[PDB]
Design an enzyme around this catalytic site. Structure first.
Site, PDB file in Angstrom:
ATOM      1  N   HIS A 200       9.179  -1.276 -20.369  1.00 43.91           N
ATOM      2  CA  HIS A 200       8.919   0.069 -19.870  1.00 43.91           C
ATOM      3  C   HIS A 200       7.511   0.178 -19.281  1.00 43.91           C
ATOM      4  O   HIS A 200       7.335   0.760 -18.212  1.00 43.91           O
ATOM      5  CB  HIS A 200       9.104   1.096 -20.995  1.00 43.91           C
ATOM      6  CG  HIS A 200       9.096   2.526 -20.532  1.00 43.91           C
ATOM      7  ND1 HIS A 200       8.169   3.449 -20.976  1.00 43.91           N
ATOM      8  CD2 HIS A 200       9.908   3.195 -19.677  1.00 43.91           C
ATOM      9  CE1 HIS A 200       8.412   4.621 -20.415  1.00 43.91           C
ATOM     10  NE2 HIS A 200       9.462   4.493 -19.623  1.00 43.91           N
ATOM     11  N   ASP A 201       6.514  -0.388 -19.964  1.00 48.95           N
ATOM     12  CA  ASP A 201       5.132  -0.334 -19.480  1.00 48.95           C
ATOM     13  C   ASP A 201       4.964  -1.106 -18.192  1.00 48.95           C
ATOM     14  O   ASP A 201       4.390  -0.602 -17.234  1.00 48.95           O
ATOM     15  CB  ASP A 201       4.164  -0.905 -20.506  1.00 48.95           C
ATOM     16  CG  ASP A 201       4.377  -0.333 -21.874  1.00 48.95           C
ATOM     17  OD1 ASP A 201       5.043   0.720 -21.989  1.00 48.95           O
ATOM     18  OD2 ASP A 201       3.867  -0.936 -22.836  1.00 48.95           O
TER      19      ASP A 201
ATOM     20  N   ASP B 270      12.812   4.824 -17.045  1.00 46.53           N
ATOM     21  CA  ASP B 270      13.110   5.640 -18.215  1.00 46.53           C
ATOM     22  C   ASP B 270      14.522   5.472 -18.753  1.00 46.53           C
ATOM     23  O   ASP B 270      14.703   5.274 -19.956  1.00 46.53           O
ATOM     24  CB  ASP B 270      12.855   7.115 -17.920  1.00 46.53           C
ATOM     25  CG  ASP B 270      11.385   7.436 -17.829  1.00 46.53           C
ATOM     26  OD1 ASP B 270      10.569   6.558 -18.196  1.00 46.53           O
ATOM     27  OD2 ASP B 270      11.050   8.564 -17.395  1.00 46.53           O
TER      28      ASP B 270
ATOM     29  N   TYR C 255      11.991  13.457 -11.360  1.00 41.47           N
ATOM     30  CA  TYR C 255      13.160  12.920 -10.689  1.00 41.47           C
ATOM     31  C   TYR C 255      14.380  13.753 -11.038  1.00 41.47           C
ATOM     32  O   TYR C 255      14.270  14.802 -11.674  1.00 41.47           O
ATOM     33  CB  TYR C 255      13.395  11.459 -11.094  1.00 41.47           C
ATOM     34  CG  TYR C 255      13.217  11.169 -12.571  1.00 41.47           C
ATOM     35  CD1 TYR C 255      12.027  10.622 -13.052  1.00 41.47           C
ATOM     36  CD2 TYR C 255      14.241  11.428 -13.488  1.00 41.47           C
ATOM     37  CE1 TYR C 255      11.861  10.335 -14.400  1.00 41.47           C
ATOM     38  CE2 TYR C 255      14.083  11.146 -14.845  1.00 41.47           C
ATOM     39  CZ  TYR C 255      12.889  10.597 -15.290  1.00 41.47           C
ATOM     40  OH  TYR C 255      12.721  10.295 -16.620  1.00 41.47           O
TER      41      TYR C 255
ATOM     42  N   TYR D  79       6.258   1.051 -15.455  1.00 40.31           N
ATOM     43  CA  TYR D  79       5.413   2.149 -14.991  1.00 40.31           C
ATOM     44  C   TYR D  79       4.279   1.598 -14.159  1.00 40.31           C
ATOM     45  O   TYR D  79       3.827   2.232 -13.206  1.00 40.31           O
ATOM     46  CB  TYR D  79       4.841   2.924 -16.177  1.00 40.31           C
ATOM     47  CG  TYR D  79       5.735   4.043 -16.653  1.00 40.31           C
ATOM     48  CD1 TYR D  79       7.119   3.965 -16.503  1.00 40.31           C
ATOM     49  CD2 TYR D  79       5.197   5.187 -17.242  1.00 40.31           C
ATOM     50  CE1 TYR D  79       7.941   4.994 -16.920  1.00 40.31           C
ATOM     51  CE2 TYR D  79       6.011   6.223 -17.664  1.00 40.31           C
ATOM     52  CZ  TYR D  79       7.382   6.117 -17.495  1.00 40.31           C
ATOM     53  OH  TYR D  79       8.197   7.142 -17.888  1.00 40.31           O
TER      54      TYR D  79
ATOM     55  N   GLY E 223      -0.888   2.234 -24.448  1.00 38.27           N
ATOM     56  CA  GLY E 223      -1.214   0.845 -24.152  1.00 38.27           C
ATOM     57  C   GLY E 223      -0.318  -0.206 -24.782  1.00 38.27           C
ATOM     58  O   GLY E 223       0.806   0.082 -25.188  1.00 38.27           O
TER      59      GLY E 223
ATOM     60  N   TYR F 228       3.862  -2.546 -28.514  1.00 35.38           N
ATOM     61  CA  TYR F 228       3.931  -1.889 -27.219  1.00 35.38           C
ATOM     62  C   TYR F 228       4.417  -0.456 -27.142  1.00 35.38           C
ATOM     63  O   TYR F 228       4.168   0.210 -26.146  1.00 35.38           O
ATOM     64  CB  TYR F 228       4.746  -2.743 -26.245  1.00 35.38           C
ATOM     65  CG  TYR F 228       3.992  -3.964 -25.783  1.00 35.38           C
ATOM     66  CD1 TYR F 228       3.981  -5.132 -26.544  1.00 35.38           C
ATOM     67  CD2 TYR F 228       3.229  -3.926 -24.618  1.00 35.38           C
ATOM     68  CE1 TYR F 228       3.224  -6.229 -26.157  1.00 35.38           C
ATOM     69  CE2 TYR F 228       2.471  -5.011 -24.223  1.00 35.38           C
ATOM     70  CZ  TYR F 228       2.469  -6.160 -24.995  1.00 35.38           C
ATOM     71  OH  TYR F 228       1.703  -7.234 -24.605  1.00 35.38           O
TER      72      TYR F 228
ATOM     73  N   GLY G 189       3.981   3.163 -27.563  1.00 33.88           N
ATOM     74  CA  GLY G 189       2.835   4.017 -27.815  1.00 33.88           C
ATOM     75  C   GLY G 189       1.777   3.709 -26.774  1.00 33.88           C
ATOM     76  O   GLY G 189       1.987   2.869 -25.917  1.00 33.88           O
TER      77      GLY G 189
END
Ligand SMILES: [Ca+2]
Length: 118
Positions: free
Chosen positions: A46-47, A92, A66, A50, A30, A26, A28
Site C-alpha cells: 500500500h505504501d 486502497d 475517487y 501511494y 511510515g 508497515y 501505520g
C-alpha cells in the site's frame, strides 16, 4: 482519500481501520525493515503504491477523492478517465481486500521497535 480508504476497509472486512493504525513494521505512519507477516506485507505494498501515486501529476493520495461502490463485501472502482483516481482507488481497494483476507496475529501489534523492523 484517507476517509474513503477506511470506509473501503469495513466494506471488504470486519476489522475497522483502528485495528491497523499500528501493526507490524508497515501498517501505520511510515515503515521500515521487512514485513513480518502477510498483513504487514499488505501495508508494505500500500505504501509503495501511494509513493507511486505521487509520481502522477496533480495526485495526492490523502486529498484525492475517487469514485467507488461498495456492495459488501464487494468493492468496485468506477473511475477510468481520471488516472489519479483510478490508480489511487486501486491502491486502497487492493489493500482493503488484502487486509480482510490476511490473518491478524495480535502478537505483531506494536513491534515497531523490535529488531524485526530494521
Ligand atoms: Ca505505512
Amino acid at each position: 482519500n484517507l476517509i474513503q480508504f477506511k470506509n473501503m476497509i469495513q466494506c471488504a472486512g470486519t476489522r475497522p481501520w483502528t485495528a491497523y493504525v499500528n501493526y507490524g513494521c508497515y501498517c501505520g505512519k511510515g515503515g521500515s525493515g521487512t514485513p513480518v507477516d502477510e498483513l504487514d506485507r499488505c501495508c508494505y505494498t500500500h505504501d509503495n503504491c501511494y509513493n507511486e501515486a505521487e509520481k502522477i501529476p496533480g495526485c495526492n493520495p490523502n486529498i484525492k477523492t475517487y469514485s467507488y461502490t461498495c456492495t459488501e463485501p464487494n468493492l468496485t472502482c468506477t473511475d477510468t478517465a481520471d488516472t489519479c483516481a483510478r490508480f489511487l482507488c486501486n491502491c486502497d481497494r487492493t489493500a482493503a481486500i488484502c487486509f480482510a483476507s490476511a490473518p491478524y496475529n495480535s502478537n505483531n501489534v506494536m513491534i515497531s521497535s523490535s529488531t524485526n523492523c530494521q
